[PDB]
Design a protein around this ligand. Structure first.
Ligand SMILES: [Cl-]
Ligand SMILES: [Mg+2]
Length: 145
């Protein structure tokens, strides 16, 4: 199971220490598009401000055991697929993705990332939960706002 770094911090706690009103702080979201009807707009938005880490993985609703905090209906995604991890990096809040040695891989902006390695996320970045785009019905967009 995933063990958080010593400098893990939630965006809420970080931004609160800095004494920031809504308009003066950065907030974080995972925007989920269901590809087949993305013209209708985002299917869901997951708030990423309250925890220092979020486990992404399979949750179909098709009995199913769910471990992930962010459950995506991807048939070929793993139950524990990847983690979104916030870190207070020498005083600067940064966010990383790490693939948890998933079966099919995690793609960041169409690049399969190396397994078990934090890779920095930037606003607008697109995650998909397989190295095979053909198999992905969803795309997950990391947003800073
Ligand atoms: Cl590599
Ligand atoms: Mg959930």
């Amino acid at each position: 199971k995933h063990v958080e770094p010593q400098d893990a911090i939630s965006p809420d706690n970080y931004m609160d220490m800095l004494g920031l009103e809504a308009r003066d702080r950065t907030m974080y979201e995972l925007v989920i598009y269901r590809k087949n009807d993305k013209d209708k707009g985002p299917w869901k938005r997951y708030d990423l401000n309250g925890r220092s880490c979020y486990l992404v993985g399979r949750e179909l609703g098709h009995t199913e055991i769910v471990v992930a905090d962010i459950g995506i209906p991807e048939e070929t995604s793993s139950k524990q697929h990847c983690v979104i991890q916030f870190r207070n990096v020498r005083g600067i809040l940064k966010c990383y993705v790490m693939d948890l040695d998933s079966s099919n891989g995690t793609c960041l902006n169409n690049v399969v990332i190396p397994g078990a390695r934090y890779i920095e996320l930037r606003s607008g970045d697109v995650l998909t939960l397989s190295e095979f785009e053909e198999d992905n019905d969803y795309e997950l967009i990391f947003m800073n706002v």
